[PDB]
Amino acid sequence: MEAGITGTWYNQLGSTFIVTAGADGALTGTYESAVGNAESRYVLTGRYDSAPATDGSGTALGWTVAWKNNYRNAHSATTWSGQYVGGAEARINTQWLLTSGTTEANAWKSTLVGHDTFTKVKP
Amino acid sequence: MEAGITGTWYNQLGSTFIVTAGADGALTGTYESAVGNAESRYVLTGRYDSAPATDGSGTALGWTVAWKNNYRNAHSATTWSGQYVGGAEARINTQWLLTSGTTEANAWKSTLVGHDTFTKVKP
């Protein structure tokens, strides 16, 4: 139902996040590269607060991408957790966790942490 | 001043954290391996709340180890952030961030996240 969220978003690197915000709170779409060829496209699914507070607070949301498609398998998954802030300069501020499948011994280097900011305007 | 904190601590892996809690709030010591030879020993420094609440809350603290000694340089630094919980089974519950120096292009894989639990008894 969140038209505010539904659409195309771009992060600082040029990656494109295309999402549809369902009235039920579902997020569905695809994540791809700057040179968005099919080989760089991956499916995403997530959830968002479909009834946010009206006091000016952002809209909490999160989504996951498993890095496997018909062209590649990076044996990993990334989750983005953050909030949508609407307005003239709408943005989705997030923090992410990228976990790679590792052997038990290598579990110490299994999870990278970072952050991304998405906007409606191409970088 | 925190005698509770001063001493030898061990995490799940066998790593040994030897620290002295200064009356001023300073933490000073060394971090080393299970087979604690000199080659595995690194200097640490940190800070802790020297006047914690008495309502049963833990004691907030944090420390840093730069992974360089006279035998090796892993070009990285780890910070542990957590709290000391005293008592019969005293423990230091932490979450850590390990950052490696990377080129600008590789900054995405610069930071690993994890957690450690330290106890007074050897694993």
């Binding site: 690197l13 040029g14 990656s15 494109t16 994540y31 791809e32 590269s33 700057a34 760089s40 991956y42 991408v65 890095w67 590649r72 990076a74 990993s76 990334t78 990228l98 | 995405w108 894989k109």
Partner: peptide, 8 residues
């Protein structure tokens, strides 16, 4: 090693 998330 690189990763599809950042080749984007």
């Amino acid at each position: 090693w690189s990763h599809p998330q950042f080749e984007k």
